[PDB]
Amino acid sequence: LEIIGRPQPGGTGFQPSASPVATQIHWLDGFILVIIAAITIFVTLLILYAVWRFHEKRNKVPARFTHNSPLEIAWTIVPIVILVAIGAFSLPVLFNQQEIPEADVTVKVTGYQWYWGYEYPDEEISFESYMIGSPATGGDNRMSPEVEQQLIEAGYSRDEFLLATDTAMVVPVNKTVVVQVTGADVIHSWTVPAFGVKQDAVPGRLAQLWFRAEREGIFFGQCSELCGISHAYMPITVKVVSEEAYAAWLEQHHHH
């Protein structure tokens, strides 16, 4: 499996998209980024031009105007218009994001201090996922010769330290996955940047999110609500595989 959902050295953009929802986020953000960059460059150029054009040595007698009705109407209406344009494109994305489709695969995720529990209710599969290098694998949340060898043995490299877990959430590609998220003790937050999903794991509440992965590979997330001492050390690994490889994984868990 190719490692796809991960930060890259010196990166300035989003993590790669692997879902239709992530693609929409990339488009919506890029659209807004052009707007706010235009606005910001415009504001900045106006200030710099004004400083150059009206520096005291170049314009020795200041004007005294304090109004300009056409300009003030324009600079109230155009922002409103720009915001309505953004909202017009952004509310549809929001609805697509938050309306839960019918599940092909259902996983129930529980955040604990400091690890994640996974349950596939249709499959009677449950397991816990710890960071490779956590105390659960014999570490203490730092790189070491043993941790790098564990990363290598699990199919990763030292560069995936703090991202890779001992077990992965495995799902089939091109299927609708509905994830139910709750917290066992304090609030955690379950997320995968490549899928464009994030949902707080709140004790006492079961929240839902959905994704459909559009390509196979490995995708990482990290706990995204400060939960205590090992908040930085309870990540998320999702492996998106063929329908057949998914079934093979299910069968490996079937007790005879």
């Binding site: 991960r6 930060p7 890259q8 050295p9 990166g11 300035t12 953009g13 989003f14 993590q15 949340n141 030292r158 560069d159 995936e160 330290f161 703090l162 991202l163 940047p193 997330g221 990290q222 706990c223 995204s224 400060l226 908040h231 930085a232 050390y233």
Partner: peptide
């Protein structure tokens, strides 16, 4: 944008 969370003492090498 690369997904680095808040409130982390340590971070993956790519950051």
């Amino acid at each position: 944008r690369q997904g680095m969370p808040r409130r982390y003492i340590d971070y993956p090498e790519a950051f």
